[PDB]
Amino acid sequence: LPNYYVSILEGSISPFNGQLYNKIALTCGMIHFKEFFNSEISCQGLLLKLVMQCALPPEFYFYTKQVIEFEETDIRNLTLWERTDERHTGRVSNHAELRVLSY
Amino acid sequence: LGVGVQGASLYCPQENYTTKKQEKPQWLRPVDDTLAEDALDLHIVVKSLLCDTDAFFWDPTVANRLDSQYIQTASDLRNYRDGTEIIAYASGKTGSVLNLTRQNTLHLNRHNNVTSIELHSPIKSIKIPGASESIGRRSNLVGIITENSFQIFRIESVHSRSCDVMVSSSEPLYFVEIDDLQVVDFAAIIDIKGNWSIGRIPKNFNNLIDNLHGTIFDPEELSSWKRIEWFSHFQKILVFDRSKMIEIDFMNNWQTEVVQAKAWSNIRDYKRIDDKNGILLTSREIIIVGASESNDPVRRISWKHDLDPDDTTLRITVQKVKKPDHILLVAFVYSMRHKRIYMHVFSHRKANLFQSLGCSTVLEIPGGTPTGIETILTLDFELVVDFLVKLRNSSEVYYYALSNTVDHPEWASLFNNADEREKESIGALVSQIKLKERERISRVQNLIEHENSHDEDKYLQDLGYRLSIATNELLESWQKTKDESIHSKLKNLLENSDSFASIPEFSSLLDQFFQYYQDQDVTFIGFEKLLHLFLHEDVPGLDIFYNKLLQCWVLVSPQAELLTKEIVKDIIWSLARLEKPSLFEPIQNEISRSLSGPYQDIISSWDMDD
Amino acid sequence: VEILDNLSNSSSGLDFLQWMCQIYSSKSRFVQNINYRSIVPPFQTGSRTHTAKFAITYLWSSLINCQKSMLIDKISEWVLTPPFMEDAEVWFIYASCHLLKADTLSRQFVNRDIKINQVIKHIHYVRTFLKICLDKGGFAVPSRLIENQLKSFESRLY
DNA sequence: TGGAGTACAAGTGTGAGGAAAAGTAGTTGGGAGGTGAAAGCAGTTGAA
DNA sequence: TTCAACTGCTTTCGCATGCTCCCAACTACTTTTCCTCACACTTGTACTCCA
Numbered sequence: 026l027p028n029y030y031v032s033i034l035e036g037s038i039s040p041f042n043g044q045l046y047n048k049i050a051l052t053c054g055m056i057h058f059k060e061f062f063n064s065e066i067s068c069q070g071l072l073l074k075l076v077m078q079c080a081l082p083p084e085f086y087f088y089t090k091q092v093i094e095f096e097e098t099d100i101r102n103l104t105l106w107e108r109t110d111e112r113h114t115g116r117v118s119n120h121a122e123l124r125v126l127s128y
Numbered sequence: 129l130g131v132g133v134q135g136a137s138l139y140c141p142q143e144n145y146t147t148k149k150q151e152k153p154q155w156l157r158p159v160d161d162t163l164a165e166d167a168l169d170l171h172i173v174v175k176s177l178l179c180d181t182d183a184f185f186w187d188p189t190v191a192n193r194l195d196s197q198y199i200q201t202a203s204d205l206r207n208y209r210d211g212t213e214i215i216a217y218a219s220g221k222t223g224s225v226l227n228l229t230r231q232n233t234l235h236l237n238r239h240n241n242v243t244s245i246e247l248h249s250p251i252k253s254i255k256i257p258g259a260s261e262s263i264g265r266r267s268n269l270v271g272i273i274t275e276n277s278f279q280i281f282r283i284e285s286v287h288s289r290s291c292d293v294m295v296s297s298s299e300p301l302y303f304v305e306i307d308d309l310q311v312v313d314f315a316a317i318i319d320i321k322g323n324w325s326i327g328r329i330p331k332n333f334n335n336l337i338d339n340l341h342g343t344i345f346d347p348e349e350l351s352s353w354k355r356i357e358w359f360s361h362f363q364k365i366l367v368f369d370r371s372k373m374i375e376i377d378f379m380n381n382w383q384t385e386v387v388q389a390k391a392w393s394n395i396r397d398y399k400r401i402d403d404k405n406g407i408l409l410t411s412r413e414i415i416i417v418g419a420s421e422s423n424d425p426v427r428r429i430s431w432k433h434d435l436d437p438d439d440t441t442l443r444i445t446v447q448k449v450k451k452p453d454h455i456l457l458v459a460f461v462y463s464m465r466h467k468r469i470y471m472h473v474f475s476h477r478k479a480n481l482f483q484s485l486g487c488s489t490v491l492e493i494p495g496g497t498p499t500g501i502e503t504i505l506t507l508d509f510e511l512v513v514d515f516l517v518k519l520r521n522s523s524e525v526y527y528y529a530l531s532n533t534v535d536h537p538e539w540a541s542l543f544n545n546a547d548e549r550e551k552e553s554i555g556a557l558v559s560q561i562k563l564k565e566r567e568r569i570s571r572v573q574n575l576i577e578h579e580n581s582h583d584e585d586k587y588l589q590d591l592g593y594r595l596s597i598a599t600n601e602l603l604e605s606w607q608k609t610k611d612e613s614i615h616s617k618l619k620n621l622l623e624n625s626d627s628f629a630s631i632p633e634f635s636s637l638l639d640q641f642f643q644y645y646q647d648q649d650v651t652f653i654g655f656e657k658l659l660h661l662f663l664h665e666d667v668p669g670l671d672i673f674y675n676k677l678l679q680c681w682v683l684v685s686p687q688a689e690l691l692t693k694e695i696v697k698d699i700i701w702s703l704a705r706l707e708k709p710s711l712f713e714p715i716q717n718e719i720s721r722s723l724s725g726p727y728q729d730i731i732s733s734w735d736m737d738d
Numbered sequence: 739v740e741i742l743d744n745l746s747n748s749s750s751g752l753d754f755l756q757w758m759c760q761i762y763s764s765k766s767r768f769v770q771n772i773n774y775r776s777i778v779p780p781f782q783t784g785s786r787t788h789t790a791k792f793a794i795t796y797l798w799s800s801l802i803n804c805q806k807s808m809l810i811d812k813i814s815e816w817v818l819t820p821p822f823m824e825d826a827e828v829w830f831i832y833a834s835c836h837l838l839k840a841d842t843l844s845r846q847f848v849n850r851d852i853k854i855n856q857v858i859k860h861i862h863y864v865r866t867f868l869k870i871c872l873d874k875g876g877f878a879v880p881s882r883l884i885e886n887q888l889k890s891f892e893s894r895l896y
Numbered sequence: 897t898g899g900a901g902t903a904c905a906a907g908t909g910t911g912a913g914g915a916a917a918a919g920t921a922g923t924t925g926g927g928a929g930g931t932g933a934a935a936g937c938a939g940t941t942g943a944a
Numbered sequence: 945t946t947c948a949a950c951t952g953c954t955t956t957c958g959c960a961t962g963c964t965c966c967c968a969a970c971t972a973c974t975t976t977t978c979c980t981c982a983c984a985c986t987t988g989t990a991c992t993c994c995a
Contacts, residue, residue: 029977032916037979044980063615069702073662073695082684083691087568091561112981113907129883131830135876141781143739144791145799147827149834150880151887153841159802392778434781764970769923772971899994906988912981919975926968934956942949 046120054109064105066121068093093128129479130160132431140484141434162431164475164483169511169532171490176233176527178516181219186441186464188353188370191253191273191311193218194518194525196234198505199256200266203285211507212286214293216270218251219523226251226272228291234504234516234527239291245281249274257314258402260361269329271312277302278309280316280329296333308352313400315358317365322346324356324367326378342383344374357400359407360425370394373409375427386427396442401457402505403448406476408459410435410444415459417474417482431482433472439463447503447513453477458513462501464520467492473511494534496521572690575629587627588637594621596644603649606709613720616707625701629693632671634700648710659703742799752803755796759784763793789825797831801838810839826874833867836860837887844894857895861888 026034040048058064076086094100106119118124130148132138140146146162194217204210213234219225224247228237253273259265269282280298301316303309309320316327316337323343328336344354344367355368363379373387373395389395389411397410405425409416414434421428441464449456455476460469469492473485492498496519503515511532516525578584598620619625628634642652660667667673674696681688722733741751768785777783784790797817804810814835822828840860846853865888868881 027977028918028975029916029979031918033978035916037915042981047980061614067702067705069695069698073699077662077680083681083695084685086691086695087565088561091557091564095557095560113909114981115907117906129880131879133876133878135878141791143742144795145742145802147794147798147831149798149802149831150883151805151834151838151841153890158805392780766924766970769970772923773973775972777971897995900992901994902990902992904988904990906986908986909984911983913979915979917976919973921973921975922971924968924970927966929965931963933959936954938952940949940951942947 043123046123047114049120050106050108050114053105053107057107057109058105059107064107064121066103066105068103068121068125071122071125089128093125096128129481130162132162137429138431140431142436142487162483164485166485166509169473169485169488171488171530172533173490174233174527174529174531176235176529178215178234178525178527179217179219179236180525181523188351189252189308189310191255192500192502193223193251193254194500194502195255195270196502196504196516197256197258198266198507199268199283201268201283201285205265211266213504213507214283216254216256216272217525218254223251224249224274226254233529234514237291241291241293243293243295245295245297247274247279249276251275253312255312260315260404262361262404267314269314271314271316273309273312274300275308278312278316278318282333298330298333299335301336310352310354311356313357315361315400317356317358319354319356319367321352321354324354324365324376326365340378342376342378344369344372344376346371353395355395355398357398357407359400359427360404360420362425364426366398368395368398370396373398384426397444397461399444399446401446401448403455406430406455406457408444408446408457410442410459410461412438412442415444415461415472417457419480422480430480431474431484433474433484435461435470437461437463437470439465441465443500445501445503445515447515449511449513450508456511460501460503460515462498464497464499467494467497467519490530492517493519493526495519569690571626572629572694575627576690578629584628587623588634590623591621591628592637592641594623595641599650602707603647606649606713610712610716613717616705618701618704618706626694629690629697631674631693631696634697635670648712651708651710652706653708655704659699750803752796752800755792755799758792759790759796763790787824789822789828794827794831797828801831801834805838808842810835810842814839824874826871826877829867829871829874830877830879833864833871836863836867837884840864840888840891844891846894854895857891861891861895864888 052058053064072086072089076083093103097103103121103124105121106115108115118127131150132140132146132148140162148161149159152158152160194215196213196215196217198211198213200210201212204212212228213230214228215236217227219227226245226247227242229235251272251274254270255272256270257267259267268284269280271280273279277300279300282296282298283293284296286293298316305320307320307323309318311319314329316329318325318327318337322345323341325337325341328338330336346369349369349371351370353368353370356365358364359366359375362377364375364377367374367376371388371390371394372385373389375384375386377383387395387409393411393413395409396412399408399410401407404420406417406419409418412435414432416429416432418427418429418432420426442461443463444459444461446457446459449458457474457476459472459474461471462469469489470487471489472487475483475485477483498517499520501515501517503513506514509532512529513531514527514529516527518525575584602620645652656667656670659670659673663673663676674692677692677696681692685691722730725733739751741749741754744751762782763784765786768779768788779785779788781791784793800813804813814832817828817832817835820828837860840857843853843857843860864884868879868884871877871879872881
């Protein structure tokens with residue numbers, strides 16, 4: 026195996042500045058993750074973990090939840106985005122799990 | 129005197145177990161290494177406060193912005209009174225504003241009166257020289273360097289009735305030779321970029337540079353750090369850069385390049401210790417205590433210790449300690465990247481005998497990092513020391529007495545917006561949850577009074593039947609849609625999808641709902657072996673998942689009871705992805721897409737090999 | 739020092755310095771034209787005209803340890819085998835091996851045939867090996883004090 | 897009142913900066929190699 | 945004449961042999977192909993000050 030098929034295949038650099046989501050954009054474009062599979066996330070399994078990390082009283086679980094219901098058009102369906110076009114990662118934070126973190 | 133020298137260099141790195149045996153048969157320490165032996169030295173702060181107020185580089189032409197040392201004015205050159213400690217520092221907008229007593233610590237005076245002389249140029253260096261013990265006094269003058277000028281001031285005869293510190297002056301001698309000057313020392317002796325001169329100081333503030341000077345100009349040195357000091361009082365200046373040290377006598381005509389540090393080091397800082405002979409030099413990779421020579425005071429390079437931290441912006445402060453049989457010399461290096469310190473304890477004995485102890489470090493305040501650390505002369509084995517710092521991205525001057533005995537602006541200045549129509553409409557959601565939290569505590573309390581009833585049991589009887597119709601429809605909704613080669617809700621019901629309140633009793637329903645199905649096209653993923661990413665440990669039952677969550681929010685909530693029930697139930701409304709088809713569904717598509725590629729793609733699509 | 743300052747279940751620290759001067763010690767010439775990165779001469783390599791910092795460390799720390807078991811012949815033979823014919827600091831310690839012999843042997847515990855004219859070698863080895871320390875380059879020794887040490891050894895020789 | 901310029905935003909277009917195991921580069925510093933007598937005695941020529 | 949001469953050949957055993965690398969060890973800079981997204985212009989929709 027040649028000298029650059031061994032270095033790409035090893036863990037040379039870590040994913041940085043949101044690099045991990047941006048390969049999921051090429052993974053949602055080279056095959057469309059929409060209209061084949063389902064891009065719905067279990068966002069309650071997300072927020073269950075984030076409460077006991079910071080150990081606020083669990084009142085903020087629904088207080089976060091009323092925020093997400095108020096902002097999201099079509100309340101449910103914090104879906105994952107697709108990008109099939111080019112290298113232009115959109116500057117919108119279109120990814121589902123990152124939207125929960127800003128909420 | 130020991131044995132270790134070379135005549136040009138003299139080394140003792142960290143725990144080399146150095147080269148200075150003599151085999152003294154005196155039956156008490158039969159070796160005289162360059163190392164001491166004693167117990168530890170832990171350092172604790174005594175914190176106080178004194179006063180207050182492109183991006184990937186730093187301009188080395190700045191040296192200091194503050195100085196503070198004991199002074200002896202003309203009235204103290206006359207009377208019995210000797211010693212008042214002052215401070216000379218900068219403040220204001222661009223640092224161009226130029227402006228005491230010791231109760232138990234160092235503190236600013238009671239009369240809160242500084243001497244505000246106005247300066248029309250940014251300040252690059254503030255220092256007072258300090259005098260020698262062969263002239264008997266402590267010098268009353270002060271020399272500073274601006275960006276546009278070079279101004280020399282002088283303190284004269286302060287008061288005690290109001291603690292009034294007043295200044296006389298020398299004039300701003302502007303750049304008649306138009307080159308920026310770098311580091312001054314008095315002990316108008318100046319170091320311009322590459323060249324230098326010896327000046328004359330006037331006593332006449334009622335209205336200069338001699339014809340002896342030189343240069344060290346290195347064409348192969350691309351920085352502009354320069355540095356001069358009087359060395360051993362015989363009109364010998366030491367002119368530095370980040371490449372070499374030149375020894376220049378400006379009274380005779382005799383120049384010498386002494387140190388040459390271009391190969392694997394540089395010169396970072398050179399603090400002139402108030403001692404006449406012993407003076408430290410800080411390089412990178414090594415801390416040098418090169419003193420002067422006994423016979424002929426030219427230069428004698430003495431015992432040194434290596435320094436592992438590497439950076440381009442390292443400086444040093446060094447404070448003596450007088451003891452009866454010896455003299456300590458602590459060595460605080462610091463940088464502009466981090467908050468850490470590094471210290472070493474040398475020792476000077478009577479026959480120019482040097483030793484060493486070891487190294488330690490302390491911690492500091494998390495607002496920025498230091499840029500300049502200044503020690504206190506303190507007017508004169510239970511070691512003590514005192515100093516004061518100044519951090520970057522700050523302008524406060526703390527106080528420390530070390531002895532042997534995080535809010536970011538962008539996370540704060542982004543919120544709290546100041547409009548009038550938008551002043552309470554953000555809180556409309558705050559009024560919305562108070563419309564829903566008062567609601568959704570009464571809707572659950574319908575079910576909380578229901579405990580082991582028949583009135584709540586008939587809901588689950590309808591629940592096992594309302595899911596059972598649309599799911600066998602969904603099982604055959606996947607056989608009609610099987611000729612595809614091209615999905616899970618658990619919200620098929622519409623009654624409430626919230627109307628039962630028990631952790632053990634719904635598990636009796638769903639496991640019986642699991643014993644309902646045995647045919648193909650219906651498959652259920654695990655829950656007692658798949659929930660466990662939250663507790664990060666064993667979850668032997670879904671019921672005892674709630675058990676320690678019941679032991680979790682006891683003190684932090686009103687009544688603490690029903691919310692922990694309903695979120696665990698909401699995971700059953702969220703984690704339960706239970707509509708995977710059976711084995712005809714992957715197998716019909718693990719071979720069909722395997723046919724879309726040829727025989728080259730077959731064997732390169734391979735598992736079950738290890 | 740983590741083996742030298744442990745001394746509880748130790749490997750004595752001096753076996754590791756023996757590991758250093760057995761595999762890294764090379765007598766190549768310092769070629770000086772190649773641009774050295776990540777290996778630097780003055781504190782980790784051991785070329786000709788530059789005895790290694792870890793090689794002369796294993797000299798002093800195995801003579802201080804050699805005193806503190808009271809084996810001197812085990813190192814006096816061992817220093818004899820390299821002709822480090824450039825540096826002067828290894829000639830002082832090669833004199834200092836015999837200077838510890840002429841201090842330890844010159845006791846005699848009587849209150850006399852071979853012990854008197856064996857030390858007369860060890861005085862003569864310190865005197866000739868200190869002169870070749872002065873014959874080489876810059877490394878000054880207190881050779882006025884050592885002859886005050888050596889004559890005090892002679893006071894029990896007589 | 898009916899019609900023009902402030903700028904919230906948004907997708908279009910073009911290369912550039914980063915990574916590493918490999919290789920060739922530049923010196924040395926070793927190593928074994930490989931490119932007549934002791935005495936005859938004769939014949940013949942010796943030479944001014 | 946008288947003489948050397950130097951060439952020739954023979955036992956005795958015999959002693960008995962006489963252009964400079966090529967490749968290791970160090971090291972270093974360069975080789976080879978890959979990878980993830982910044983800059984800027986432009987375009988839209990809006991509400992301002994327009995007679």
